[PDB]
Amino acid sequence: LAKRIDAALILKDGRVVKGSNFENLRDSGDPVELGKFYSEIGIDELSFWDITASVEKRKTMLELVEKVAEQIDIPITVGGGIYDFETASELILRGADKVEINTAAVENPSLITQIAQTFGSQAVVVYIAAKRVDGEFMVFTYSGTKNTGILLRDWVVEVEKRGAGEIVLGSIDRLGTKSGYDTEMIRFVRPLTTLPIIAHRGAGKTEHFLEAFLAGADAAKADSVFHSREIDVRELKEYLKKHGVNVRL
């Protein structure tokens, strides 16, 4: 029940895409060091999202998960182009606490059930990328480019039914913006599911996290707004505690 503050790291070839601004780090593009630093200053969970599109993708993610598991103690999620049970299984066995699937879940929802059947629902995260299209929230796959024709309200119900443990709700209408999380979309989904809802996309300032939790989010995920140091994780948690939000300090 404590509200969660999650940091996500976008990776290509084992490197943090666009780096960070933590001058104090030995390598500002090293996902292991950046992740360990975040765990020290009080991030609650970490996401490693791989956009590597090469024949080396699978082998790279597994070696990264090995290193991260040794040095980092907080929950680790890994995602990005995980397409089948075998890939998911190896990542979990190598040390990932949770695997995140999106396009493969939409195309083959049985995959949700296969993963949860062996590892439990707690190990399955479904990232849902959604966007308003002609007055309706619709689900998008392939890095947000494919309108599947599936309604968000239908897919949320099916994801829980299939056995996912939590849903990351990413508003494509907030991609790259700094104007706030999509609280209308969070409020839309909240009554439809009892699963943990993770808000993603749009965070630009500390008050946006308060808004997301008042909307019913169980966690808030951000990336560049942390890496750029626009928002300090410690200052964010003290702000949220100050204003009545249950965060782990």
Residue numbers in the entry: 2 to 250
From the paper:
Computational design of KE07 involved construction of a theozyme to catalyze the chemical reaction, which was then grafted into the scaffold of imidazole glycerol phosphate synthase (HisF) from Thermotoga maritima. Catalytically essential residues from the initial design include a base (Glu101) that facilitates C−H bond cleavage, an H-bond donor (Lys222) to stabilize the phenoxide intermediate, and a π-stacking residue (Trp50), which was designed to stabilize the transition state and favor substrate binding through interactions with the aromatic ring of the substrate. This initial KE07 design (Round 1; R1) catalyzes the cleavage of 5-nitrobenzisoxazole, with 103-fold rate acceleration over the noncatalyzed reaction and a turnover rate (kcat) of 0.018 s−1.
The mutations in R7 and R7-2 (Phe77Ile, Phe229Ser, Ile102Phe) result in further optimization of activation energy. For example, Ile102Phe results in phenylalanine filling a hydrophobic cavity and a small adjustment of the main chain, which increases the distance between Glu101 and Trp50, allowing sampling of the Trp50 rotamer, which is then stabilized by an H-bond to Glu101, thereby stabilizing this alternative configuration.
